[PDB]
Amino acid sequence: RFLKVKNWETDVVLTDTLHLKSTLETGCTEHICMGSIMLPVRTKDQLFPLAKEFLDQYYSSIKRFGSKAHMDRLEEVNKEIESTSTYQLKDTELIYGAKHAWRNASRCVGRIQWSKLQVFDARDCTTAHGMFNYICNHVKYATNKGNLRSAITIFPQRTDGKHDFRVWNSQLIRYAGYKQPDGSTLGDPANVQFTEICIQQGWKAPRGRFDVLPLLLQANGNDPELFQIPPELVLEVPIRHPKFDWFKDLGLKWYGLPAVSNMLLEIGGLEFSACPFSGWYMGTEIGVRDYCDNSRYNILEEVAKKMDLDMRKTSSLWKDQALVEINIAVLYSFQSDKVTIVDHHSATESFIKHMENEYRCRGGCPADWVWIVPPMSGSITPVFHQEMLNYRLTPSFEYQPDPWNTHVWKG
Amino acid sequence: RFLKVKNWETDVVLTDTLHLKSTLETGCTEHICMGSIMLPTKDQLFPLAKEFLDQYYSSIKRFGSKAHMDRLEEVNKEIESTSTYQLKDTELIYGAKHAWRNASRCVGRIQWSKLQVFDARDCTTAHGMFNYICNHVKYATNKGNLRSAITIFPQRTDGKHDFRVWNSQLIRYAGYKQPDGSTLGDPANVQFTEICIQQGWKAPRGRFDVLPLLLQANGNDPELFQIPPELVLEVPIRHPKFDWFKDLGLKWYGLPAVSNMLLEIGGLEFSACPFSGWYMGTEIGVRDYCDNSRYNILEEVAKKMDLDMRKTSSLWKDQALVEINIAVLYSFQSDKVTIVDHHSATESFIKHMENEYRCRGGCPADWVWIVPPMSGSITPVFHQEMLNYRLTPSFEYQPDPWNTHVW
Numbered sequence: 001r002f003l004k005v006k007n008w009e010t011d012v013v014l015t016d017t018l019h020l021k022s023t024l025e026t027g028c029t030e031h032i033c034m035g036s037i038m039l040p041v042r043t044k045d046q047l048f049p050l051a052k053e054f055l056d057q058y059y060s061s062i063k064r065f066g067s068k069a070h071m072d073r074l075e076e077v078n079k080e081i082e083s084t085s086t087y088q089l090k091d092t093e094l095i096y097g098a099k100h101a102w103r104n105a106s107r108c109v110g111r112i113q114w115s116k117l118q119v120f121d122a123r124d125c126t127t128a129h130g131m132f133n134y135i136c137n138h139v140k141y142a143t144n145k146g147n148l149r150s151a152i153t154i155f156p157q158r159t160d161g162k163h164d165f166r167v168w169n170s171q172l173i174r175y176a177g178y179k180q181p182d183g184s185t186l187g188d189p190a191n192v193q194f195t196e197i198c199i200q201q202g203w204k205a206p207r208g209r210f211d212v213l214p215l216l217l218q219a220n221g222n223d224p225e226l227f228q229i230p231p232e233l234v235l236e237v238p239i240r241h242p243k244f245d246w247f248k249d250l251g252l253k254w255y256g257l258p259a260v261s262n263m264l265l266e267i268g269g270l271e272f273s274a275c276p277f278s279g280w281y282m283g284t285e286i287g288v289r290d291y292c293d294n295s296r297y298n299i300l301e302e303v304a305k306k307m308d309l310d311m312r313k314t315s316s317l318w319k320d321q322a323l324v325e326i327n328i329a330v331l332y333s334f335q336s337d338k339v340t341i342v343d344h345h346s347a348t349e350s351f352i353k354h355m356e357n358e359y360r361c362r363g364g365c366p367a368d369w370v371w372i373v374p375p376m377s378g379s380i381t382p383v384f385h386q387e388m389l390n391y392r393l394t395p396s397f398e399y400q401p402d403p404w405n406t407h408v409w410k411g
Numbered sequence: 412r413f414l415k416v417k418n419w420e421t422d423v424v425l426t427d428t429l430h431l432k433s434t435l436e437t438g439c440t441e442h443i444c445m446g447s448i449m450l451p452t453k454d455q456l457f458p459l460a461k462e463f464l465d466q467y468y469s470s471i472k473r474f475g476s477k478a479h480m481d482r483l484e485e486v487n488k489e490i491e492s493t494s495t496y497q498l499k500d501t502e503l504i505y506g507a508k509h510a511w512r513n514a515s516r517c518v519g520r521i522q523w524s525k526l527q528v529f530d531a532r533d534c535t536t537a538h539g540m541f542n543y544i545c546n547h548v549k550y551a552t553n554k555g556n557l558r559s560a561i562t563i564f565p566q567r568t569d570g571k572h573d574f575r576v577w578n579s580q581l582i583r584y585a586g587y588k589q590p591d592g593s594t595l596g597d598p599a600n601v602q603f604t605e606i607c608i609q610q611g612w613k614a615p616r617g618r619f620d621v622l623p624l625l626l627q628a629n630g631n632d633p634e635l636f637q638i639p640p641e642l643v644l645e646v647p648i649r650h651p652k653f654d655w656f657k658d659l660g661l662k663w664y665g666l667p668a669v670s671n672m673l674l675e676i677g678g679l680e681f682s683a684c685p686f687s688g689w690y691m692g693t694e695i696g697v698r699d700y701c702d703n704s705r706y707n708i709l710e711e712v713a714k715k716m717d718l719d720m721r722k723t724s725s726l727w728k729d730q731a732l733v734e735i736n737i738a739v740l741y742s743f744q745s746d747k748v749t750i751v752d753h754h755s756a757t758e759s760f761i762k763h764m765e766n767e768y769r770c771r772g773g774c775p776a777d778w779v780w781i782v783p784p785m786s787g788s789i790t791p792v793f794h795q796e797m798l799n800y801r802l803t804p805s806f807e808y809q810p811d812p813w814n815t816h817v818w
């Protein structure tokens with residue numbers, strides 16, 4: 001069965017066969033679409049088919065399908081599962097899996113860069129302190145003095161689900177949020193709950209508006225431990241506007257390395273519950289979501305006041321106006337400091353090319369339109385008018401419950 | 412089976428049951444989501460009629476009454492006899508209001524119960540259709556104080572006697588492919604501005620030329636009619652800041668009147684059913700003015716603003732796009748022509764959404780279409796999970812007549 005998507009701006013039609021190789025479920029049925037829902041201990045019984053499916057893909061990509069190396073590997077993995085109820089990936093397999101998980105991320109606009117992922121293998125790690133050391137080396141390598149490089153560090157896989165490695169932070173670098181007695185929040189509102197835990201775990205909070213959160217790391221199912229990232233390793237960027245001089249006086253800065261640390265890497269049925277990865281920012285991630293979301297720093301108001309906007313009627317589009325200037329500042333500041341960043345026009349443009357190429361060479365590209373389209377200026381980027389098919393391929397990145405909800409405290 | 416949706420900006424959770432009454436299909440499967448795709452007999456007819464009549468009579472607190480059971484019987488007979496059937500006026504009004512209420516892609520549904528329905532089922536000719544359409548346009552416009560309306564022409568019979576309005580909206584601007592190879596006027600309507608000539612329109616080959624109506628009645632060849640200009644209310648577009656804005660020579664019409672959809676009620680098919688409301692500002696300013704495949708005036712507007720159009724990262728398209736939209740809203744409001752901004756509309760939609768969850772058990776909604784084409788995440792709908800499903804009565808797409816019409 002074939003499927004076609006159409007770009008309504010350019011009339012380009014593409015044909016999808018890759019969706020046939022789709023395993024997981026979307027959430028949708030013939031009767032209902034869950035396309036806008038944010039979120040839609042494994043037995044040997046169900047592990048070997050997963051392992052085979054992965055190994056077959058892998059040996060196909062290297063053009064050794066049905067070879068002796070391929071067959072011997074199947075058998076080696078077979079014997080290891082029935083003997084140990086799990087298996088270990090070669091370095092070759094691990095790198096491949098990590099890159100492909102990224103490649104299969106239907107919600108990712110940055111996938112053009114997927115082949116260039118730096119993979120650090122942290123599967124020999126046994127402690128939190130070890131975890132800290134690995135993460136530090138990730139942060140330094142990825143940051144590269146502002147010249148950002150995509151990387152992922154991969155800690156040991158889940159075994160019986162009772163010995164999990166987890167990074168408790170949602171991103172390796174993020175600012176504290178503190179709820180005040182009056183109800184106002186100091187810092188980043190998204191991180192209030194997490195900041196509380198850290199403080200309770202013994203963090204001494206500087207209690208400013210831009211405090212870098214400490215790392216909270218869990219090894220082999222043990223209680224998590226606090227570590228402070230060396231500040232010389234945390235690249236931060238002061239935010240100024242190229243025309244508005246009072247902008248600097250807003251006192252804003254952001255960090256340069258976006259590094260998501262709370263997802264789950266599934267490769268060949270194996271589960272990697274700590275797999276922090278990093279790229280670089282699309283400007284609107286900071287400029288629209290981080291600053292101007294109502295449930296974040298929410299500086300639309302103050303930026304608007306200082307612009308002397310008519311904030312009386314909403315039909316004056318004072319929010320829209322201010323939002324654009326803030327995004328202008330973000331790109332400006334980052335580029336001035338020679339810290340890698342991409343604008344949403346450039347990023348979405350690059351994605352359409354990636355997507356077309358993926359259709360030609362791979363037979364499809366799963367994409368989630370709800371997430372690919374940027375959170376401002378939607379229709380003036382080319383992804384808006386691009387039809388997309390969504391489906392799930394493995395290897396993949398998955399969500400997981402927050403660790404403070406599932407963890408069994410030792411003491 | 413009892414689904415929940417969360418708003419991630421407000422933590423509010425609504426539960427959906429209404430989806431369980433869904434009849435049609437989505438395009439999607441358990442293996443693949445098509446959410447972003449634009450377009451996904453006697454024994455057929457009675458169950459359809461019954462389903463409608465059941466929900467109709469339930470809505471007036473007379474489910475299983477004499478009237479209800481009598482009516483089911485009555486319609487059963489007419490179907491068995493005539494192979495089709497006719498709606499009572501009450502049912503027709505209820506059906507139209509509900510086709511709108513069920514339009515999952517429509518952000519403006521808070522107004523759904525206040526629809527004026529004009530029954531034009533007694534119409535026989537293109538000249539007839541023209542008269543009814545002029546009356547619709549005058550009523551709806553209401554000297555700028557816009558009122559929602561729909562005009563309903565006779566239902567399909569055997570697909571050979573179809574009434575169709577060939578225009579995609581009752582009011583739209585002409586577009587002509589030039590020897591220069593570019594495009595004057597509105598590029599969306601180049602093919603249609605052509606067909607108007609193939610049937611003999613005398614195009615004043617200009618820019619904002621109001622297209623003539625091309626009406627087909629009872630399956631006959633369509634005929635051209637020119638809407639009286641005094642019935643077409645227009646708004647000159649000026650910026651409340653940039654005096655040079657007026658120089659761009661821009662205007663738009665106030666009445667958005669969609670005329671190419673198919674209204675389905677209780678199994679019956681109304682292929683000519685032009686309906687109208689009022690614009691959300693971004694429909695004109697973001698899409699009509701700035702789409703690459705439309706008036707595409709971004710380049711020009713940014714130039715008069717003297718923005719650095721050298722690098723995409725200056726966000727000059729963004730800055731200009733906003734100004735353009737400010738003007739549109741400003742012009743309409745200053746001319747006392749009804750319009751709504753995307754902030755207000757989306758806010759009203761969350762309210763409507765909450766009402767529908769409360770008094771109906773839900774609200775089918777297509778996020779890809781509800782979220783405005785600019786400033787997405789600064790409107791409340793961006794953070795609103797929605798469920799999409801197909802309820803009936805409904806408005807459906809239908810092929811362009813020229814691709815179909817037996818000539």
Ligand code: HEM
Binds near residue numbers: 150277278397
């Ligand atoms: C290198 C530059 C990159 C850019 C510019 C980029 C951009 C983005 C953006 C804007 C989103 C949407 C996030 C949101 O608004 O919530 C996203 C999502 C995502 N990215 Fe990329 N990304 C990059 C690299 C990466 C890398 C290196 C990986 C994995 C190794 C990755 C995996 C993902 C995944 C799995 C999601 C979806 C998150 C979710 O499902 O909640 N991205 N990306």
Ligand code: HEM
Binds near residue numbers: 526561694
């Ligand atoms: C009165 C104020 C109204 C507002 C503000 C409004 C707004 C909108 C908007 C913004 C869209 C998105 C379409 C696009 O961007 O191209 C839309 C679609 C739609 N509207 Fe409403 N509308 C209104 C009245 C009506 C009425 C009176 C009807 C029918 C009786 C209606 C039926 C529909 C339908 C069926 C769609 C989706 C059509 C499609 O699938 O393309 N709307 N509306």
Ligand SMILES: CN(C)Cc1cccc(OCc2ccc3ccc(N)nc3c2)c1
Binds near residue numbers: 110261262282
């Ligand atoms: C706190 N979590 C539950 C929410 C969450 C967890 C993980 C990922 C996520 O999506 C945002 C995201 C993920 C990966 C990215 C990679 C590069 C980049 N520039 N931005 C990203 C942005 C959102």
Ligand SMILES: CN(C)Cc1cccc(OCc2ccc3ccc(N)nc3c2)c1
Binds near residue numbers: 579687691694
């Ligand atoms: C040529 N066709 C693709 C145009 C077309 C056909 C069918 C539906 C359609 O949807 C746009 C639409 C529909 C109804 C509306 C009602 C009020 C309003 N302000 N805008 C609307 C906008 C647009």
Ligand SMILES: C[C@H](O)[C@H](O)[C@H]1CNc2nc(N)[nH]c(=O)c2N1
Binds near residue numbers: 008384387388779
């Ligand atoms: C490809 C995609 O389905 C298409 O561009 C859709 C996206 N969302 C839209 N949303 C609205 N309101 N109107 C549209 O025409 C579209 N077009």
Ligand SMILES: C[C@H](O)[C@H](O)[C@H]1CNc2nc(N)[nH]c(=O)c2N1
Binds near residue numbers: 037038372793795797
């Ligand atoms: C309700 C919806 O699922 C949710 O708000 C989504 C919408 N689209 C998004 N798109 C991106 N890139 N990031 C997001 O967090 C979201 N949030």
Ligand SMILES: [Zn+2]
Binds near residue numbers: 440446
């Ligand atoms: Zn779907």
